[PDB]
């Protein structure tokens, strides 16, 4: 004789991005991928402005929450996603913001293409030996058929040779937004 009132829930963890793009197919449309890229760029740009370094942003750190909302995390074969300057062993501090930019570019390339980088050679010691004394980067030919061209230029600018010519995050956000509000189909 004293009914009730409905009570809401609290929250629930969503599926990781690595599981989405390596264990299942889960193919979306171009607009959704651009939206996810813009969201992760915005999150990195906010973390950018208080001198906090993420220090690594592996794909399984990225969460696709309920509906579509990207969320970045720190919880934690991973010799692929550190900068070519990380392999060094001098001064014990080769880390700066350009390393996070490079790893964001790696995430973006995987998001556009959908395959693991360096799929030709599978040997961890060989890979690290070649990278630490080489200039070999994943080929840009493996792209989607209807991918834009400015995105390819941004990816080429993501990691050229050195930690001085990488672009800063606000430029990436502005370019991503400009391409986002210009893309009906191509």
């Amino acid at each position: 004789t004293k009914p009730q009132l409905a009570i809401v829930t609290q929250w629930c963890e969503g599926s990781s991005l690595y599981h989405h793009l390596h264990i299942i197919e889960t193919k979306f449309e171009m607009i959704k991928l651009i939206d996810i890229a813009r969201q992760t760029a915005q999150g990195m740009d906010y973390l950018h402005a208080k001198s906090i370094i993420h220090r690594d942003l592996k794909s399984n750190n990225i969460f696709l929450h309920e509906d579509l909302t990207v969320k970045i995390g720190d919880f934690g074969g991973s010799i692929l996603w550190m900068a070519p300057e990380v392999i060094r062993m001098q001064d014990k501090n080769p880390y700066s913001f350009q390393s996070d930019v490079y790893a964001f570019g790696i995430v973006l390339y995987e998001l556009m293409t959908g395959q693991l980088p360096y799929s030709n050679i599978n040997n961890r010691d060989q890979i690290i030996f070649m990278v630490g004394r080489g200039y070999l980067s994943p080929d840009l030919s493996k792209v989607r058929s209807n991918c834009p061209k400015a995105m390819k230029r941004l990816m080429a600018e993501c990691l050229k040779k050195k930690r001085d010519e990488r672009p800063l995050f606000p430029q990436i956000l502005a370019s991503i937004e400009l391409l986002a509000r210009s893309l009906p189909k191509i």
Partner: protein, 267 residues
């Protein structure tokens, strides 16, 4: 309206619960399935323009899935005459129904409660009154054997092709409501446990099984087979009504023993 209803259906059903001055003009916007439309949401206003003259109330069922309700034992007779029932498959429907009780000066009665009647001729009513005496001893026999697990075991007209079904009392939580309230967190279950879930039992005098049981039980009163038969019938009927068993292990073992008997292992 289809696109708007698919996404924001839950907020309307809270208005009938928490608001008390706008129920009349908000009850029109609800849209359910029905037993005549395959994939098309009808409405209560359209439903009231389709019932026969003799009909007097709205019939509804609170279930768990569309397919499970589509062939339930409760709606097996009310659909034979040609009447219409409306499906409600979501917890929020249960939460909202308890407040909405009137529509166009008409009452809503469920098909999963006690005291459900169909206005019809006195011929079949007299026939059922006559048959109400032939199944009198079995009433007290099963009442004793079930040992204060159910309160009343009488005869009534709700089924045509099912030997048993179970229904709840008039005032108290139904089966789906009980499941929903038991499942959730933050229960504060120090109170609710010893208050609700009153139950009754239902039988029909048409299936061969009940007639065979009666003809067997008139001869012997203390046989061992009747206990096994009534226990198995109660377990199966309790299973196929939305409830949850107290211990699945015993039922599973009974099924395994039955199969082993049917395939010859003995011992």
């Amino acid at each position: 309206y289809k696109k708007f209803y698919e996404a924001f259906s839950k907020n309307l059903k809270l208005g009938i619960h928490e608001d008390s001055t706008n129920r009349r003009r908000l009850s029109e916007l609800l849209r359910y399935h029905t037993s005549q439309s395959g994939d098309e949401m009808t409405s209560l206003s359209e439903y009231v323009s389709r019932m026969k003259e003799t009909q007097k109330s709205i019939y509804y069922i609170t279930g768990e899935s569309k397919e499970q309700v589509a062939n339930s034992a409760f709606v097996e007779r009310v659909r034979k005459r040609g009447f219409e029932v409306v499906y409600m498959t979501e917890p929020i429907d249960e939460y909202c129904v308890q407040q909405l009780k009137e529509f166009d000066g008409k009452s809503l009665v469920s098909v999963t409660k006690e005291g459900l009647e169909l206005p019809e001729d006195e011929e079949e009513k007299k026939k059922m009154e006559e048959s109400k005496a032939k199944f009198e001893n079995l009433c007290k026999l099963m009442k004793e054997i079930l040992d204060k697990k159910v309160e009343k075991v009488t005869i009534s007209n709700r089924l045509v092709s099912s030997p048993c079904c179970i229904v709840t009392s008039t005032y108290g939580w139904t089966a789906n409501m009980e499941r929903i309230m038991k499942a959730q967190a933050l229960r504060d279950n120090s109170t609710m446990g010893y208050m609700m879930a009153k139950k009754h039992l239902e039988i029909n005098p048409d299936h061969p099984i009940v007639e065979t049981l009666r003809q067997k039980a008139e001869a012997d009163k203390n046989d061992k087979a009747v206990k096994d038969l009534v226990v198995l019938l109660f377990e199966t009927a309790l299973l196929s009504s939305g409830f949850s068993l107290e211990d699945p292990q015993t039922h599973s073992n009974r099924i395994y023993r039955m199969i082993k008997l049917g395939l010859g292992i003995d011992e």
